[PDB]
Design a protein around this ligand. Sequence first.
Ligand code: QXU
Lengths: 352, 351
Amino acid sequence: DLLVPKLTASVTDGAVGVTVDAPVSVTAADGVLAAVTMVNDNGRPVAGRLSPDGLRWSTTEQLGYNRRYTLNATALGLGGAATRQLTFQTSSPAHLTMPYVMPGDGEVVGVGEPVAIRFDENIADRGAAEKAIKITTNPPVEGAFYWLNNREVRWRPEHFWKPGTAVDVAVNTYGVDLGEGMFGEDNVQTHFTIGDEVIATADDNTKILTVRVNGEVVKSMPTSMGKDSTPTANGIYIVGSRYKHIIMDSSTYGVPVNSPNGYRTDVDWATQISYSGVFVHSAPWSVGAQGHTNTSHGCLNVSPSNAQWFYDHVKRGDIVEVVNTVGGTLPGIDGLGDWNIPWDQWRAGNAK
Amino acid sequence: LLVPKLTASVTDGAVGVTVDAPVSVTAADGVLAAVTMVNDNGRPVAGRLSPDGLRWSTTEQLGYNRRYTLNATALGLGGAATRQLTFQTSSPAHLTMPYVMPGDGEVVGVGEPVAIRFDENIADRGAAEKAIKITTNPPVEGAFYWLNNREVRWRPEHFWKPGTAVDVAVNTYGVDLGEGMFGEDNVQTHFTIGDEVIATADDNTKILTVRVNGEVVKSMPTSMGKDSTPTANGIYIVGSRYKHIIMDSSTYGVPVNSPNGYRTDVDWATQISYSGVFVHSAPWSVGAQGHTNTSHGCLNVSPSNAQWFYDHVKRGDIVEVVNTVGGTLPGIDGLGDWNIPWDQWRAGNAK
Ligand SMILES: *CC(=O)[C@H]1O[C@@H]1c1ccccc1
């Protein structure tokens, strides 16, 4: 009279819709696992590993969608043996969606850079997407998720990041039902660091763009912003990509070139600060207007010299704030206007 | 013509007849004229003959440790038939009474498990599980798991969906629960799942955020257990609510006179673990709430936030703790059912 080994698996025989966001395990009690195999609906075996003590076996590669797996396990012991065969089917997505995360892995970014997770499909279950995203911060700081549209979600703290903060983003979305049968195509995993505090302020009262590094003025640039008919909106702008030169085409923003407010001109040293088309760029033609009157379509015109300096000394995530213009406020969902949404609204989020 | 034939759901001379079902008498090639059943004291058992005269059944429950005598007369085209049966019902060595939670008619949160607590150790856990019928609308899969030798729990893999109906039929009367132990009685309870309410206490931020149906409705600065007596991570099920309570550490195994012991009156206390973790009013730690941990394990919040928790949270709601320096709440705590992985829970420990 002795104990008979028992077998415990993380799946049920006959189970359907098994999610592939976790390994499949099989455990032996009152005995050890003598043989554990697992094959798919073809013949190919599934990779796995057994613990040295012989009690725990797990798969070591990710399991695929739309697969029927067959699991055979045998357990031995002083008091007998036990064998079990289990077959189960994994999730069968209706559609797949792949996430993309910014900033890039290893980047050093300014204090205003939000964590960004953009999917290539609409997300029916935003809560499920948020649950699947794990964000670590050192030093730890509370942030919250907020959706700019149906496909991109952002995560940021109440105030600007503290320089030196380490941020780690893991979007563990493979095998996760993101709503209406849409499952994540894969996981993504990026890490970045917050750099120096760089805040540039363009004051319409003075028509000056002052760059502050760690709270001290390092550059004062005369500027000409949008005229009354096409003014530059007030608010907080997040610096984005930087270009040695770029063709500013209004058609990419929905405004034809031939229309009154349209344009197509090649400019130098252009730093993007809004998705709606606001740049800090070289503007030789308005050097005389810079510091006095507004003549552009919204962009912050500066001298070629100050434009190259801005390009060289400003990095993705730095902040450009505009105040006292005749325009409104930059939309919070512009894509670089995250900080214009009041914190209570951002904190509460819009997972619905 | 044919002499009618009389058959019964019991047979003459039977012993150990279980009283979980009624006794019946059926006629073939004829009809029943009369059926009488009496116990050993000569008291008749209430019974009902079907309109067609073919089937007779007891209409009251039969007792343990009883000898019943059944007499049936039948008439057919070929003549009459008569029969007399005698049988003896189960003679339990012991009886056990079940207790079922939550209460009948209640509205509970999405983490509320079905509970059946017997007042004796159950030697045949499989027999008790087989005798408990759970109905859910909308239907959802669930499984049994035993916290101790006397209490068994039933829950789904994921939290309940709001609006779900749950019907529990503990049909243990007349059932052998092992080693001659039989159910003292049956129990029936029905309850409903209300709004989804999930409160997350994050130790990295030291905020207790209450979400009702996915919407942030309250943010409470909190002070959890200090390093020496930390608040454990994991999922807590909300239990009882107290306008005021005497926190006594001996109730949870720690002598009051010991270093980690305590005995203080506390306002607006919501229990979330049998181990003694509460959400309660802590005016003495208002400065530390949202900054540092200073408690014995409880979630300290301000008086206004404690009372708010008392009013808007109900039995079955969820409090989840994360990023603390403690361990994970035991799955068999009594309110930590969800800390058991579904595979371990579904497999069960019925043996
Ligand atoms: C965003 C802007 O207002 C600048 O790109 C605008 C432009 C530059 C040069 C000529 C015409 C328009």
